[PDB]
Amino acid sequence: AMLPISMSDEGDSFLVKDSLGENKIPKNPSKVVILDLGILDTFDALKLNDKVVGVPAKNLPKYLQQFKNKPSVGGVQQVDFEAINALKPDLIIISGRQSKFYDKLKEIAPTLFVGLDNANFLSSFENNVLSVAKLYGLEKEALEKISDIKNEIEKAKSIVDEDKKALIILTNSNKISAFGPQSRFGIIHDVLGINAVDENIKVGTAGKSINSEFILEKNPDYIFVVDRNVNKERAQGILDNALVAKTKAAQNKKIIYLDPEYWYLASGNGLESLKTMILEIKNAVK
């Protein structure tokens, strides 16, 4: 299990420990640079927009356009360190995609990691939300919102068919990769309890390289597609063949194209963006 964030209250600051290291973080930080999209959504949800001074305003998705005029500190993959320094922030918040930049960010300002543990997604989301809330004294508000998401999960689980199985795939122009439980797409299996056609896909970010023959072999009842092409080529075209057509998922129009701006960008730290993803699965399978 990923080490959670722990915090001790030291008057006008917190001593904070997470999996990447220790930071003294001021109470009520007023100049926050956020590189994790999900936790930026959580700042919205907690009414903290005015604390934010920098975002990755290159890739910003549709649901985060209230931040489109904030100073940009980069994109989905690149970080602009000159920019972050010029903002003179009091806190930087990052998740897994940015752990590679930890030491250089921490030379600028305290750097808080809000990682999502693929083996323990809900506990890490809750810990990430509540920890940001504690910086601002908003535990009450955050616990209410976390309750709302737990309720949503229970409504979603309650309609899942125990006998049906799903496959998760990531598509490229000319390649399909499969993902399973405890992957970065895993909440479909792990949180919502939809069974997988293959619970033994090996752990790792590249997933398992597959073909349409594999898909027909597994004969999923649902196929969840995350289309990285979102190129001319789309997942609909990769899957437009007589092997896939034969599957229960094809025949029942349960090939589901999930919005990559949520799944691929892994916005699970968002109080609203997680909800959106929960409902997107629910609605696909009810």
Numbering used by the authors: 22 to 251, 255 to 310
Quote the study that presented this structure, word for word.
CeuE, an integral part of the CeuBCDE ABC transporter of C. jejuni, is responsible for capturing Fe(III)-siderophore complexes in the periplasm for delivery to their respective inner membrane transporter. C. jejuni does not itself synthesize siderophores, but capitalizes on their secretion by other bacteria, such as E. coli.
All five mutants (Y288F, H227L, H227A, H227L/Y288F, H227A/Y288F) were crystallized in their apo form, and all structures are closely similar to that of wild type CeuE. In contrast, the effect of mutating the histidine was less pronounced. The Λ-configuration signal was observed for mutants H227L and H227A, indicating that these do indeed bind Λ-Fe-5-Lic.
